[PDB]
Structures are given as C-alpha cells and as structure tokens.
C-alpha cells in the first residue's frame, strides 16, 4: 500500500524502479544481499516462510520474475557498454546466489527415504522448501530463448576488447559468471526435471495457484536451446589465448561437458557442422598452436598444486580424454585439434601441414613427455608428475586402441623411436626409495595419497610393456631385421648410437608379499561387530551405507537409556576406525587389481618375446635361467 490494489501497486513500483541503470543495479544488489542468510554462505531458506501470506502472492517469486523480465527485455536501452556489462554481472551474481542456495543431496535423500522409510512429519518441511525456494522459477526461466540469446550475445564479443582489457575488467568477470551459471544449470537440470516439476505440477493441480509459464515445451533439455549456436565453441576456443587461468579452466570444462553430451553430437553428426565451423578461417590451427605453446610452458616447483599452468594442462588433458573416450569410432574435435584431417568415416594427413612437419599438439605432448624427469632427490618419485604422465599415457592408449587412428599413430611413433625414449626415462623401484618423502612400509601409506601415484606408475609400466610387445609383434610380422637388432639390444641391456639400461628382469620388482596387502589386522571391535558391509557393495564399499546403519544403531542405543553418555566415545572411535578400515580395504583392492593387470601385461610381453624370437637360444639360455630363478619364488 504505497499510497489501487496491491497487485497493481507492486508492479507499478517495480516498473518505476526499472527505468535507468543505477537504481536497477542498486535494487538488484540489495536483493542479492538480502537473499544471503545471516550465518553466511543446510536448511532454513533465507526468507520468512510467511512472506506474502496475507495477500494473494506467490511469495518471493515476483522479485525473480521481474529481474528476469528486465534482464531479458530492457537490455537494449543501455547505450553505455560499461553500464550494460555491470547490469549483466549483477544479474549473473543474483542468479548464482539464488542457485547456490538450493539443497541437492537433501532433496535426493528426502525423495528417496523420507516417504518410503521415514514418517510423514518432515515431508511437509521438504515440500514447503521445494515450493517456496526460487530455484524452480530460475530453472524454468533458463529454458527461455531470451535468456540464452542474451547469454550468447554477452559471451560473443570481439577479441581486441578482451586483449586490451584488464584482468579485473567487468567483461571477463561477467563471462566467468555466465559460464558458471551454465555449468550449474547443466548439472542441476536432471535433478530439477526429476524432483521439482512433478511436485510443483501436483501442488498447482491440488491447490489454487495462478502462475504464467515462461518455459518452452519444445526445449526438452537445456542443450536444445544452445545447439543452434555454432560460434559458441569458436569463441570458447579463441578465448584460450588470453592467459586468464580461471576463464581458461571454465571454458575447458564447458567444452568438455558439451563434448560429453549426446544430443549435441547427434544433431551435429546425424555430414557435420562443427568440423566445417572450425575450418572457416583456420581456427583449429591457431587453437592447436595456442594449446601447444601453453602445455610447453614450464611450471613452478614450489607451487606444484597451485601452479595455474599445471591446472590448465590437467584441464586440457581431461578434456581430450573425455572427447576421445566418448564415441571413439566416429571422429571428433579432438582428432582435428591433434592435426588430423577429419573426413566422413575416414582420417588422413595433408602435405606440409602442422602434423606432417612434426609440429602439432600430439608431437608437443610427445616432446613434453620424453623431456620429463620424475626421479628426484629431495623427495623422489613425485606425485603430480606421475599423474601427468598417467593422463598422457591414457590419452595415448585411447588413441591407439581406436582402429581409425591406430596405423598412422604407430607409424609416427616408430618413426621417432618413442619406445627408446620411454625406456631411457624408466626408473627402478625399490622398497628404499620413498614416495614424496614417505616410506611404503609405513601404515599411513595405505591412508595417504601415495597409493594413487603407485597405481598410476603401475598402469604406466603396464601400458609401456603392452606397447613394446605390440611393436615387437609388428616388427616380427613385418619380417625386417633392421629394427629387431635394436630391439634385442635394448632388451639385452645395451644401446648402440654404448649406453646401458636395466633389462626387463630388473623391472620385476613389483611382486612382493612382504607388505602383506592381503592380510589386514582386525581390531577387537567389541561393539558394532554385527554390522556387516552387505549394502555397501566392481569392488566398491560405500561408506554412507554403513554410516546410516551405525547412526540408527546409536540412536536405538541412546533411546534404550543404558549408559548412553559414557559408551558414546566407544562408538565414535569404532566408527573412526571402521571408516579407515573401509578406505584401506578399497586401496588394497585397487593395488591388487593394478598388480594383476601389470602381471598380465608382463606375461603377455614375455610370451610375445619368446614366441617371436629368431635369435639363437644358447646365448639367451642365461636370460631363460634368470627368468626361471625369478619366477620360482613367485610360484612358491
């Protein structure tokens, strides 16, 4: 009643506060600040449940509705680009503050066990939370064409502006916020369409609510509204040459999620559109060149896990892995970025191209891999180097297994002596060399993160052995002794360019039963002994399945009213021991399967070597006896 009905006065005041930019931005900031709870950034949604109960209003929805209507329609009356950028940034921040304040796991567990197991008392609380929280309205607005059009217009800008702009420029911050909102929407679209739409529809059907739809029924998902924009990927790729770590990581994650989808790649390749869009003015070439220049940039030894360069490298590697693992038979953008001529159900190399001159992304990866040393002195056997090489080897294996990109890759590898570089980069493992300053025999080893690096190193050795065996089989079937001599010399322990290297029998040091990975010390467990891991269990024992059971048991014991305060610490320490027991069992299973895979790879390599061997046997009798001596204790 601002001094005329309230439904009219409120909209009149909102429209009055919409004229201009200063007052609009100030109101948006005020609303964003008010939406923050007093405890800071989970229940008790930050607003009174009786907000607007007197008048026939939907609560706090009108505010978000007006904000979205403004951001969608009145963005053309702003001449000053700075004001428009500030308004878009404020709207994106408001949307993010509204989305981040939504419970996902809570609603999932509710819809799962509340009505099916728990009573119907708390159901009303979750219902009111889902009905009053503005997340549903934001998601509904996200399916509008105006919103995505404004977003892609804001993200589509000239490169000169971003180049001459400052890292703290509002344009970069707005683009980052928009990418984050898009990521959150792509993550929560399924949860919404599953546990919001039906409940809201049922509530609207039962009770009396007057709401105006703002979503498009045709857009069954968020990808339907964005699959019509081809310049988005081009802009995301061009924005990688700016140097901004956060923006680069966001763009890489967005491209990875896009390549991971299915409808987008079904619409693109039902000839194709992306390959021709990225080959308009040589965008792929410059993108590959920028990626190569980036991965070649060194890292900061002190800021191992904080070096933005290493983070960008890992993001690019994850993107390539996700793009190659998805739909390997049909080519993708990864093949074009590597320097291949992506043709319909066929690949090829062009003359004088970047991949022909051995200057491309794949060759850059090969170089940075062969010029990488993991053997250190101060710590020795670092972890992030191991992770990097493991990712590189996974990408190489994904490229090799694909028969569409196997022959050319093997040719390019054998034409540069990659196996020789790998062997020269090999390092022997012993129980004395610690992992990141920590010894293996220590009990904390199974609890520390060194297990991941150990599994990665085992997988790397297995992949190297498999590649060596495949190359040996190829050279044998090709009936050419020009390379067989060098292969045997490398296996004999000599190199003629003589440089010596440890033989294959030297690397047979990963089979050791002294650690007793199978045996586990079982504590007394005077209580909770009957709690098994039935619902916990692909050997993967979930911890929540036992956490809920032990919590229910503790609640029952407390309700029994028999020395509940004293014996609580016993149950607490038993749970703290059981969680580490489960983690140790999982790590032991992982180590066991890794050792099994490595042993299988080594056995296959040895079989391929023994079978395809025309060299005399009397000289190799020494190696035969050595292998027999080495396997004797293993069999025993």
């Amino acid at each position: 009643n601002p001094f005329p009905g309230p439904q009219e006065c409120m909209e009149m005041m909102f429209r009055e506060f919409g004229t201009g930019f200063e007052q609009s931005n100030a109101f948006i900031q005020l609303l964003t600040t008010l939406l923050v709870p007093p405890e800071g950034l989970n229940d008790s949604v930050p607003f009174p449940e009786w907000l607007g109960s007197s008048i026939r209003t939907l609560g706090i929805e009108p505010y978000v509705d007006f904000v979205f209507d403004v951001f969608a329609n009145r963005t053309k009356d702003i001449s000053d680009p700075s004001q428009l950028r500030i308004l878009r940034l404020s709207c994106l921040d408001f949307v993010m503050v509204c989305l981040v304040t939504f419970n996902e796991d809570l609603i999932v567990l509710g819809h799962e066990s509340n009505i099916s197991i728990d009573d119907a008392m708390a159901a009303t609380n979750l219902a009111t939370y889902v009905r009053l929280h503005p997340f549903s309205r934001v998601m509904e607005w996200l399916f509008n064409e105006k919103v995505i059009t404004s977003l892609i217009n804001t993200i589509h800008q000239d490169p000169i502006s971003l180049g001459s702009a400052s890292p703290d420029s509002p344009l970069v911050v707005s683009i980052l916020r928009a990418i984050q909102v898009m990521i959150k929407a792509l993550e929560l679209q399924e949860t919404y369409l599953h546990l919001v739409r039906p409940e809201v529809l049922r509530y609207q059907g039962e009770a009396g609510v007057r709401r105006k739809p703002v979503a498009n029924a045709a857009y069954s998902a968020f990808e339907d509204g964005i699959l019509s924009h081809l310049s988005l990927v081009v802009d995301l790729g061009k924005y990688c040459n700016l140097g901004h770590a956060e923006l680069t990581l966001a763009c890489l994650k967005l491209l990875e999620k896009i390549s991971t989808s299915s409808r987008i790649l079904s619409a693109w390749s039902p000839r194709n559109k992306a390959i021709v869009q990225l080959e308009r003015n040589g965008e792929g070439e410059t993108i590959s060149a920028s990626l190569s220049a980036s991965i070649m940039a060194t890292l900061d030894p002190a800021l191992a896990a904080s070096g933005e360069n290493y983070r960008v490298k890992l993001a690019i590697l994850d993107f390539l892995y996700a793009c190659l693992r998805a739909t390997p038979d049909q080519p993708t953008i990864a093949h074009q970025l590597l320097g291949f001529h992506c043709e319909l159900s066929k690949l090829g190399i062009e003359p004088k191209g970047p991949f022909d001159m051995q200057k491309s992304l794949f060759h850059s990866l090969l170089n940075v891999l062969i010029t990488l040393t993991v053997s250190e002195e101060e710590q020795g056997m670092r972890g992030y180097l191991v992770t990097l090489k493991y990712r590189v080897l996974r990408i190489l294996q994904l490229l090799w297994k694909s028969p569409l990109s196997a022959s050319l890759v093997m040719d390019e590898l054998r034409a540069t002596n990659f196996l020789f570089h790998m062997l020269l980069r090999e390092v022997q493992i012993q129980p004395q060399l610690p992992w990141d300053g920590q010894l293996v025999t220590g009990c904390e080893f199974l609890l520390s993160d060194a297990s991941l690096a150990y599994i990665d190193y085992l997988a790397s050795r297995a992949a190297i052995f498999e590649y060596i065996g495949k190359e040996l089989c190829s050279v044998s079937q090709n009936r050419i002794p020009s390379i067989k001599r060098q292969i045997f010399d490398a296996l004999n322990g000599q190199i003629f360019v003589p440089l010596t290297i440890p033989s294959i029998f030297d690397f047979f040091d990963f089979i050791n039963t002294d650690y007793k990975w199978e045996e586990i010390p079982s504590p007394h467990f005077t209580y909770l002994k009957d709690l098994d891991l039935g619902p916990c269990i692909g050997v993967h024992y979930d911890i929540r399945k036992a956490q809920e059971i032990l919590a229910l048991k503790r609640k029952e014991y407390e309700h029994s009213q028999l020395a509940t305060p004293e014996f609580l610490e016993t149950v607490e320490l038993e749970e703290k021991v059981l969680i580490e027991w489960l983690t140790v069992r999982n790590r032991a299973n992982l180590l066991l399967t890794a050792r099994l895979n490595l042993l299988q790879a080594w056995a296959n390599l040895l079989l391929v070597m023994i079978e395809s061997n025309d060299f005399k046997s009397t000289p190799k009798m020494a190696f035969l006896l050595q292998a027999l001596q080495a396997i004797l204790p293993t069999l025993e």
């Binding site: 540069t416 002596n417 020269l424 190199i495 360019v497």
Partner: peptide, 9 residues
C-alpha cells in the same frame, strides 16, 4: 626431420 628426437645424449 628429427632435429631433437635423435638419441644423441
């Protein structure tokens, strides 16, 4: 063609 890929330590 192989400026640095050579095995010349």
């Amino acid at each position: 063609i192989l400026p640095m890929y050579k095995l010349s330590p």
